[PDB]
Amino acid sequence: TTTRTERNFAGIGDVRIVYDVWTPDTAPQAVVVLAHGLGEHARRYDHVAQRLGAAGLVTYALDHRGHGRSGGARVLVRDISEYTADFDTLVGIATREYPGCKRIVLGHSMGGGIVFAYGVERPDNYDLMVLSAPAVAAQDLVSPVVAVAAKLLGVVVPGLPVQELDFTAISRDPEVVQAYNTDPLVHHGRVPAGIGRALLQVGETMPRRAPALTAPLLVLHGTDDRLIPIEGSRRLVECVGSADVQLKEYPGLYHEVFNEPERNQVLDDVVAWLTERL
Numbered sequence: 001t002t003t004r005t006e007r008n009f010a011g012i013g014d015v016r017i018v019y020d021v022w023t024p025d026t027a028p029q030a031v032v033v034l035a036h037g038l039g040e041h042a043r044r045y046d047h048v049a050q051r052l053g054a055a056g057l058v059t060y061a062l063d064h065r066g067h068g069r070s071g072g073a074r075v076l077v078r079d080i081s082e083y084t085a086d087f088d089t090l091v092g093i094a095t096r097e098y099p100g101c102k103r104i105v106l107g108h109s110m111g112g113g114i115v116f117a118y119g120v121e122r123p124d125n126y127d128l129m130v131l132s133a134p135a136v137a138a139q140d141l142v143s144p145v146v147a148v149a150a151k152l153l154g155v156v157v158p159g160l161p162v163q164e165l166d167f168t169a170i171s172r173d174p175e176v177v178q179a180y181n182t183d184p185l186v187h188h189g190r191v192p193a194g195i196g197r198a199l200l201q202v203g204e205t206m207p208r209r210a211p212a213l214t215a216p217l218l219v220l221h222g223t224d225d226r227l228i229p230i231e232g233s234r235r236l237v238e239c240v241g242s243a244d245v246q247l248k249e250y251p252g253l254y255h256e257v258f259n260e261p262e263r264n265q266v267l268d269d270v271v272a273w274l275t276e277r278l
Ligand SMILES: *[P@](=O)(CCCC)OCCCCCCCCCCCCCCCC
Pocket: 036, 037, 038, 039, 108, 109, 110, 111, 135, 138, 141, 142, 146, 149, 150, 162, 163, 165, 167, 170, 191, 196, 197, 199, 200, 227, 228
């Protein structure tokens, strides 16, 4: 039995960051710090934290600024460092509450881009990285001219909606898409320029920065992902400095592998990967 507690801290710029803590009723094996994707929130990951809890893992999952229960203007960010700083603070919170426990940083989509940028900047603040379709190659979705424009707009008008997303691409399960379509805490609009710039900054420097990752890395990706092409994850595992890197491709799965029909096989692979290394 894994149980959720809701807590908070003061993030960068004194924005209240809400985060959940999922504690299992068994002896804690290690801690997981989880970063959700664009426009979603940590409560869409309940079933993930429960599955990890059944493996004796404590899961820290924060609502990013402008997301879910956290403060700030909705999906507003002026720099990727705002996300990575709030994630860094959350990693430190788990490090102090569970000292000596191994630390697993886990990110999905934009969360995967934040976990990546956090990791290459603090490659010894964590022990294991798991990335679910990380948004580390956003510049492959637009022309270079559009990337020049989006970076500039992310500065001047970070709140301007700039890019529409196909929400039907998140899952092959129509129930998942409809539950996403009707979630009051999900951003039901377009990608803003500020987040567009942040993802583009991470993407252009991913090849040059990835060598800084030295901890074991697990990348998960569905082959039929229309939001983030799988080639972005193939280029990532070819570019990281980690010796123990692995990409699990899931034939036919859509973007959110954690919410797919095959999600239990996906999470079985995550637990199996973590337990060989803990
Ligand atoms: P993840 O967080 C999954 C959430 C979506 C259900 O992110 C998925 C992919 C996000 C990529 C967004 C596009 C990044 C670049 C967009 C900027 C280009 C638009 C600029 C137009 C200027 C004329």
